[PDB]
Amino acid sequence: VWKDADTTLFCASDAKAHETEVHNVWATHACVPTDPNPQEIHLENVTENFNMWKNNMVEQMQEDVISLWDQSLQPCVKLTGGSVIKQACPKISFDPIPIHYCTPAGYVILKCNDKNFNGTGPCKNVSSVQCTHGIKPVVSTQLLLNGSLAEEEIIIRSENLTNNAKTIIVHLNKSVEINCTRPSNGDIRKAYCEINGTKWNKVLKQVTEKLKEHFNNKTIIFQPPSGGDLEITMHHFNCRGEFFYCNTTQLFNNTCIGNETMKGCNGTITLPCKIKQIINMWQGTGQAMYAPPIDGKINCVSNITGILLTRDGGANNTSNETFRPGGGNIKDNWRSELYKYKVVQIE
Amino acid sequence: DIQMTQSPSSLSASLGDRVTITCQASRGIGKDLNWYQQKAGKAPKLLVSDASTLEGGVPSRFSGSGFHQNFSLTISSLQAEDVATYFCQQYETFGQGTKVDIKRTVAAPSVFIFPPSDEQLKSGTASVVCLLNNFYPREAKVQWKVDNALQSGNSQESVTEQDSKDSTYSLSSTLTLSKADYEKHKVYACEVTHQGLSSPVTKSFNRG
Amino acid sequence: QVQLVQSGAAVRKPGASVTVSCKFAEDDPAPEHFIHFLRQAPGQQLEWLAWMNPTNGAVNYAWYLNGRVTATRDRSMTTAFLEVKSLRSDDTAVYYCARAQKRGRSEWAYAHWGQGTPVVVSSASTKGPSVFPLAPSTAALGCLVKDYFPEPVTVSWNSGALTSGVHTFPAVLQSSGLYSLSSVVTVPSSSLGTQTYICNVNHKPSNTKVDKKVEP
Numbered sequence: 001v002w003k004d005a006d007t008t009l010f011c012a013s014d015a016k017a018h019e020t021e022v023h024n025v026w027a028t029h030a031c032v033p034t035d036p037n038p039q040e041i042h043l044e045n046v047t048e049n050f051n052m053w054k055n056n057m058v059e060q061m062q063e064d065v066i067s068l069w070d071q072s073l074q075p076c077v078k079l080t081g082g083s084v085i086k087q088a089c090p091k092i093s094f095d096p097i098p099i100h101y102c103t104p105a106g107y108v109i110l111k112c113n114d115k116n117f118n119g120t121g122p123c124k125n126v127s128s129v130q131c132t133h134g135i136k137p138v139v140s141t142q143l144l145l146n147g148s149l150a151e152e153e154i155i156i157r158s159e160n161l162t163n164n165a166k167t168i169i170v171h172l173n174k175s176v177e178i179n180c181t182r183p184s185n186g187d188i189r190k191a192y193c194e195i196n197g198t199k200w201n202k203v204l205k206q207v208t209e210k211l212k213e214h215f216n217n218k219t220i221i222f223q224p225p226s227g228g229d230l231e232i233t234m235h236h237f238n239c240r241g242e243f244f245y246c247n248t249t250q251l252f253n254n255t256c257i258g259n260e261t262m263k264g265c266n267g268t269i270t271l272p273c274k275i276k277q278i279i280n281m282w283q284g285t286g287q288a289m290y291a292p293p294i295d296g297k298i299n300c301v302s303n304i305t306g307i308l309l310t311r312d313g314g315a316n317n318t319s320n321e322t323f324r325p326g327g328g329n330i331k332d333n334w335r336s337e338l339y340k341y342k343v344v345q346i347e
Numbered sequence: 348d349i350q351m352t353q354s355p356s357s358l359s360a361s362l363g364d365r366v367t368i369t370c371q372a373s374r375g376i377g378k379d380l381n382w383y384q385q386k387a388g389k390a391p392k393l394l395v396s397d398a399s400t401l402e403g404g405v406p407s408r409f410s411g412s413g414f415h416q417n418f419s420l421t422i423s424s425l426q427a428e429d430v431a432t433y434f435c436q437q438y439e440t441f442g443q444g445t446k447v448d449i450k451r452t453v454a455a456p457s458v459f460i461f462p463p464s465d466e467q468l469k470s471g472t473a474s475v476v477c478l479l480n481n482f483y484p485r486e487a488k489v490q491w492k493v494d495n496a497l498q499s500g501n502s503q504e505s506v507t508e509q510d511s512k513d514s515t516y517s518l519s520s521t522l523t524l525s526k527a528d529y530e531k532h533k534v535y536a537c538e539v540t541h542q543g544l545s546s547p548v549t550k551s552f553n554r555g
Numbered sequence: 556q557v558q559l560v561q562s563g564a565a566v567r568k569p570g571a572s573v574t575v576s577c578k579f580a581e582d583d584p585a586p587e588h589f590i591h592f593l594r595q596a597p598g599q600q601l602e603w604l605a606w607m608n609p610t611n612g613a614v615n616y617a618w619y620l621n622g623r624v625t626a627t628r629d630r631s632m633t634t635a636f637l638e639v640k641s642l643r644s645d646d647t648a649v650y651y652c653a654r655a656q657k658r659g660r661s662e663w664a665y666a667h668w669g670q671g672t673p674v675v676v677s678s679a680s681t682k683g684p685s686v687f688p689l690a691p692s693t694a695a696l697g698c699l700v701k702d703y704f705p706e707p708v709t710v711s712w713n714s715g716a717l718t719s720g721v722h723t724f725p726a727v728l729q730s731s732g733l734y735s736l737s738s739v740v741t742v743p744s745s746s747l748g749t750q751t752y753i754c755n756v757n758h759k760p761s762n763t764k765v766d767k768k769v770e771p
């Protein structure tokens with residue numbers, strides 16, 4: 001017997017103590033080592049309700065990631081309200097590592113194992129664990145990177161699909177690689193991401209078909225973001241310590257999704273990106289300025305494992321639904337990895 | 348995509364009466380429905396959120412209930428200040444509204460007709476006005492006849508809000524035609540139909 | 556349930572733009588509720604237009620606005636701005652901003668409202684009213700206030716001394732694009748011949764003043 005409860009979790013990781021990489025450094029002091037042989041127990045004939053959208057594990061991960069960034073990614077200048085902080089801003093080593101979240105004594109984590117569980121409601125196949133799987137704290141917009149994949153079908157998650165003010169998370173069942181490069185030796189801030197067009201359009205087609213199931217077979221349309229700061233109108237992420245902004249107009253290109261045999265739908269899709277020194281902080285604390293990019297080839301090869309979407313509002317839309325990349329906030333990135341977990345207190 | 352059917356479209360009740368309005372949703376919506384009050388010339392005011400939670404400050408006479416597809420808003424003991432339009436909301440879609448009115452004893456309108464002024468005719472236009480004063484209920488019909496010829500399309504009217512004390516309405520109808528069209532016919536008549544009348548009423552004048 | 560503060564009334568020609576601003580906080584935790592914009596045309600239903608996330612500028616525009624609308628916020632994230640481009644006559648409406656209460660998780664339950672910003676789109680130019688008498692036959696009388704733009708006019712009788720039994724009707728918009736209204740009052744039939752009745756008309760938009768004596 002038990003009941004849903006909130007408590008202070010602790011983290012575990014395989015961080016390297018001698019490493020200068022900032023995630024390793026944070027985790028060496030903030031987390032304990034991993035349990036070699038973790039215990040998992042199927043709970044027979046147990047049904048349990050989950051809600052990924054009201055899950056306090058998410059708040060705790062958020063605090064941790066904010067704290068990691070606060071002590072690892074100091075800007076040269078920080079502009080908050082009327083306070084101007086000019087500090088030092090050395091280039092760092094940056095590459096996220098898996099972090100496990102673990103319950104204390106008296107508590108345990110219940111884990112949903114239903115192959116197509118959508119994040120809310122009853123789970124039929126439930127087990128108990130002491131820690132979650134290893135979650136990389138990847139901060140990105142629009143595209144979810146280096147995450148875990150849905151086990152069977154593509155899955156659509158939302159607190160309310162009919163609610164245009166609620167974020168939609170698409171969880172992919174097959175990853176698509178995005179290869180982002182800032183070459184050496186012409187602006188030093190100019191960069192680009194390559195994506196296999198054949199591979200991407202196949203997946204996006206499956207996503208549209210999945211959305212058709214939820215929206216009454218209506219015509220499904222993708223469009224670019226309607227507005228907002230560049231962090232959200234573009235695919236924004238951090239590669240090797242540098243802040244990338246990539247234009248995703250070409251990824252959401254209805255032309256190639258109609259399945260129409262069309263020219264150039266195959267082959268390499270090249271997105272234009274910029275490395276920016278002046279950024280708005282995702283932590284919500286105004287503008288920060290950093291030093292110019294390091295010299296040499298800057299390269300990040302990531303797996304796209306998910307997509308955040310917002311759906312266009314307006315009553316009587318009758319014939320179609322339009323979705324634009326980007327949605328919600330960075331907490332939703334953690335929700336996409338924590339959706340199948342919840343904490344309970346053993347009584 | 349959702350469709351909310353709000354009913355009735357209008358109602359009238361005496362002070363202290365119980366009034367309820369319903370909204371039916373074309374699809375299950377759980378409890379995601381809010382209710383608003385809007386008075387003439389003012390912004391809406393939230394009364395109830397999440398189907399049944401009464402908002403702070405709102406008088407205790409108001410209540411909402413329902414879930415899934417059937418939702419209601421109730422005013423126990425209607426008050427003068429409750430005269431308003433009420434409507435439900437489900438995300439960006441609103442119900443068509445319900446105009447609440449205060450019920451009084453039926454009252455026929457005093458009808459008056461005003462010919463245009465000599466001053467106005469100099470400008471080449473002629474406005475004839477028919478006034479209906481202090482009647483109830485608000486529904487009323489007005490037709491213009493010019494030499495027994497039913498006048499259509501050249502007419503506009505305006506109605507006042509329900510009066511505070513006597514709970515009555517007033518309406519004006521204005522007939523617009525050219526100066527030339529005015530100096531052609533002799534008899535101008537305002538024909539009124541209202542419940543408080545056993546039979547239609549006609550006020551008229553001879554151009555002269 | 557504090558009121559939000561919106562900018563003042565505006566008149567625009569078809570094709571032009573307008574910006575409606577809405578102060579929703581002071582320039583001094585929990586996630587910020589989006590700011591919503593809606594409009595209501597004269598004698599029409601309330602219509603949702605957009606929301607805007609003041610934290611990052613995220614927006615959602617009603618499909619039927621065809622991208623003619625943009626919503627932004629200032630740097631301190633305390634004032635929202637709604638720009639409507641390529642205005643047409645049927646954009647004429649009172650525009651509102653609205654917001655859920657911070658203490659609540661009902662994102663659409665608009666506890667906070669602005670006072671409203673009237674926006675009028677017309678090809679018509681500013682013009683003072685003509686005032687004609689509605690001569691008496693208790694007896695009724697009044698003034699016809701015709702052919703003005705834009706709203707509003709104000710009307711009093713005998714410089715305010717006469718308030719009892721006065722009905723001043725809502726203005727109607729004529730097919731000419733100009734507004735017109737009437738103001739009537741009922742009085743004793745013995746008053747006529749001795750008591751003077753004068754409607755006083757002001758039209759601020761044109762700085763026009765009219766005083767019209769009404770007699771049989």
Ligand SMILES: *[C@@H]1O[C@H](CO)[C@@H](O[C@@H]2O[C@H](CO)[C@@H](O[C@@H]3O[C@H](CO)[C@@H](O)[C@H](O)[C@@H]3O)[C@H](O)[C@H]2NC(C)=O)[C@H](O)[C@H]1NC(C)=O
Nearest residue numbers: 366367368369370371411412413414416417418419420421
């Ligand atoms: C939707 O729900 C509303 C209320 O939220 C329902 O209204 C009620 O409908 C029933 C008949 O279906 C009425 O029955 C009443 O019973 C009481 C005794 O408990 C009696 O005093 C009344 O005279 C009446 O016989 C009830 O009056 C009515 N409530 C009202 C009008 O306020 C409605 O039926 C539902 N509509 C659907 C499901 O389509």
Ligand SMILES: *[C@@H]1O[C@H](CO)[C@@H](O)[C@H](O)[C@H]1NC(C)=O
Nearest residue numbers: 041042043044045046047124
């Ligand atoms: C679960 O129920 C099934 C039949 O419903 C039963 O065979 C099984 O033994 C139950 N679980 C146990 C015993 O843990």
Ligand SMILES: *[C@@H]1O[C@H](CO)[C@@H](O)[C@H](O)[C@H]1NC(C)=O
Nearest residue numbers: 118120121122156157158161
């Ligand atoms: C998820 O599944 C549950 C079934 O209990 C359903 O209530 C909910 O609407 C589903 N959500 C989505 C986004 O499919």
Ligand SMILES: *[C@@H]1O[C@H](CO)[C@@H](O)[C@H](O)[C@H]1NC(C)=O
Nearest residue numbers: 152153154155173174206210
């Ligand atoms: C991914 O899910 C889609 C349905 O959403 C399905 O058609 C496809 O076969 C799945 N891919 C794999 C590798 O299971």
Ligand SMILES: *[C@@H]1O[C@H](CO)[C@@H](O)[C@H](O)[C@H]1NC(C)=O
Nearest residue numbers: 177179180181194299300301
């Ligand atoms: C990534 O892109 C760079 C630049 O085009 C290329 O040299 C490299 O081989 C690519 N890597 C992969 C794994 O595709």
Ligand SMILES: *[C@@H]1O[C@H](CO)[C@@H](O)[C@H](O)[C@H]1NC(C)=O
Nearest residue numbers: 195196197198199200267268
């Ligand atoms: C892109 O992916 C498709 C689908 O697997 C594959 O057939 C094609 O060879 C790839 N293109 C490359 C690797 O250039």
Ligand SMILES: *[C@@H]1O[C@H](CO)[C@@H](O)[C@H](O)[C@H]1NC(C)=O
Nearest residue numbers: 209212213214215216217218
């Ligand atoms: C949608 O289309 C499928 C065919 O792929 C059909 O079986 C289904 O009933 C349709 N309706 C809805 C609401 O999805």
Ligand SMILES: *[C@@H]1O[C@H](CO)[C@@H](O)[C@H](O)[C@H]1NC(C)=O
Nearest residue numbers: 224230233234247248249250
């Ligand atoms: C992305 O690129 C397209 C075409 O290259 C451009 O029209 C659009 O404005 C760009 N989006 C952003 C957010 O820069």
Ligand SMILES: *[C@@H]1O[C@H](CO)[C@@H](O)[C@H](O)[C@H]1NC(C)=O
Nearest residue numbers: 198260261262263264265266
């Ligand atoms: C590649 O693109 C063409 C359309 O231009 C399409 O017909 C084909 O199926 C795509 N992928 C393949 C053949 O794997």
Ligand SMILES: *[C@@H]1O[C@H](CO)[C@@H](O)[C@H](O)[C@H]1NC(C)=O
Nearest residue numbers: 250253255256262263264265
């Ligand atoms: C969509 O992709 C086609 C290739 O099939 C490309 O030629 C076109 O530029 C794209 N549409 C856009 C960018 O609007």
Ligand SMILES: *[C@@H]1O[C@H](CO)[C@@H](O)[C@H](O)[C@H]1NC(C)=O
Nearest residue numbers: 138145146237300301302303
């Ligand atoms: C994703 O993981 C790969 C492999 O560990 C890494 O090289 C890459 O930089 C990661 N991408 C991001 C955005 O963290």
Ligand SMILES: *[C@@H]1O[C@H](CO)[C@@H](O)[C@H](O)[C@H]1NC(C)=O
Nearest residue numbers: 146147174175176301302303
């Ligand atoms: C990306 O996905 C492939 C399999 O699809 C896997 O081999 C690779 O390790 C992944 N990269 C990650 C998880 O960083």
Ligand SMILES: *[C@@H]1O[C@H](CO)[C@@H](O)[C@H](O)[C@H]1NC(C)=O
Nearest residue numbers: 159160162375376377378379
């Ligand atoms: C929103 O999701 C809830 C589940 O939390 C569901 O009960 C409700 O029907 C949904 N609302 C709408 C308007 O579909």
Ligand code: NA
Nearest residue numbers: 006056057343
């Ligand atoms: Na918890």
Ligand code: NA
Nearest residue numbers: 281282284610
């Ligand atoms: Na922010």
Ligand code: NA
Nearest residue numbers: 644647676677
């Ligand atoms: Na107009």
